[PDB]
């Protein structure tokens, strides 16, 4: 599924990401844009055995278990397969375990390189939420 930015912003807000750990809502919508282009089925394999899954590209070596990645830690304690639905719940649940403090969004390379330092609020203005 491909979310429109406003529809995604509303869902992320309902699931508690607005100002979660001090990060305003636009940061999360911006992260999804640059990580998965708002596609809940996005996938990306990296040089390392790792593969990122879902709207927020959750990593298979540290956060979710896909059972094909060497050194799997599964800190969110959940199958990656379970992170590719149209319902963003599981992905948000894991994202909240990943971000434990105010440096936490650095967990997403794209957020760090393409959202941080930009007007992330621009991804949500005019959205009804």
């Amino acid at each position: 599924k491909v979310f429109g930015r406003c529809e995604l912003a509303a869902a992320m807000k309902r699931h508690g990401l607005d100002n979660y750990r001090g990060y305003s809502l636009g940061n999360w919508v911006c992260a999804a844009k640059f990580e998965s282009n708002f596609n809940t089925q996005a996938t990306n394999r990296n040089t390392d055995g790792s593969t990122d899954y879902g709207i927020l590209q959750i990593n298979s070596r540290w956060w979710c278990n896909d059972g094909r990645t060497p050194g799997s830690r599964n800190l969110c304690n959940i199958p990656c397969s379970a992170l590719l639905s149209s319902d963003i719940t599981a992905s948000v649940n894991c994202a909240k375990k990943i971000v434990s403090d105010g440096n936490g969004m650095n967990a997403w390379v794209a957020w760090r390189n393409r959202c941080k330092g930009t007007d992330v609020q621009a991804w949500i203005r005019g959205c009804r939420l």
Partner: antibody
Framework: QVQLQESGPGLVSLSITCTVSGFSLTGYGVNWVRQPPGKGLEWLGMIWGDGNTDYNSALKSRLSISKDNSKSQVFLKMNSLHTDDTARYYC??????????WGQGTTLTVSS | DIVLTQSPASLSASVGETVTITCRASGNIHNYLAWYQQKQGKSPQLLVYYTTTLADGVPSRFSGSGSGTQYSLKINSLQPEDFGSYYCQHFHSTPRTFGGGTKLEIK
């Protein structure tokens, strides 16, 4: 160790410098705010981590903000100076829509 | 531009009293409102951001609230270090503006 310090002309085109440390200008905005003696705060403008700039609408034609990421410096340039411009000028770091660290400010008096 | 109207301009209070400051925006600012405290001869310091979140180190006796176009800052049983000026500022798009300020003085 986030720090910001303003440097300026004192009495006076004008340019004020904001020298920062403890963070990268590429990841944070820097806003310029002023306060005339005994008065309130007035927003002047800002430069985002990505270089985009936005300004006070009434003052937009006389203000220019720019920066040098490698030297950790931000600059406020004002033209057509007026006595109404006499005030303490502050630069302040913006972290995700709040100004979390501010300089001590620099006083400016328009040769009047 | 969105303008902020802050009231009252001054408040005379004694340690232990509770006071409230208001800030209403001419247009919806969607929770993007922060509060600053400024002591005589010092720079403003962040107190509250995104309407209700206390900045690090700020005592819990401070509380912020509001939504849409109307916001408030409340100080419960104020202390000596609380006297000074307070300003609200919005961050909904640009340009940003500040309220006119409020001076909290000893009664």
């Amino acid at each position: 160790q986030v720090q910001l310090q303003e440097s300026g002309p004192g009495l006076v085109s004008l340019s004020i410098t904001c020298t920062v440390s403890g963070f990268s200008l590429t990841g944070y905005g820097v806003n310029w705010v002023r306060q005339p003696p005994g008065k309130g705060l007035e927003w002047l403008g800002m430069i985002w981590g990505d270089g985009n700039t936005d300004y006070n609408s009434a003052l937009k034609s006389r203000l220019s903000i720019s920066k040098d990421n490698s030297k950790s410096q931000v600059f406020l340039k004002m033209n057509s100076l007026h006595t109404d411009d006499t005030a303490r000028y502050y630069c302040a770091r913006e972290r995700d829509y709040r100004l979390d660290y501010w300089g001590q400010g620099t006083t400016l008096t328009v040769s009047s | 531009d969105i303008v902020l109207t802050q009231s009252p301009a001054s408040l005379s209070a004694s340690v232990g009293e509770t006071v409230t400051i208001t800030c209403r925006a001419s247009g919806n600012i969607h929770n993007y409102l922060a509060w600053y405290q400024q002591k005589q001869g010092k720079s403003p310091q962040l107190l509250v951001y995104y309407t209700t979140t206390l900045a690090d180190g700020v005592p819990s006796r401070f509380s912020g609230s509001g939504s849409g176009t109307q916001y408030s800052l409340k100080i419960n049983s104020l202390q000596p270090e609380d006297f000074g000026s307070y300003y609200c500022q919005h961050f909904h798009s640009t340009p940003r503006t500040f309220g006119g300020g409020t001076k909290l003085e000893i009664k």
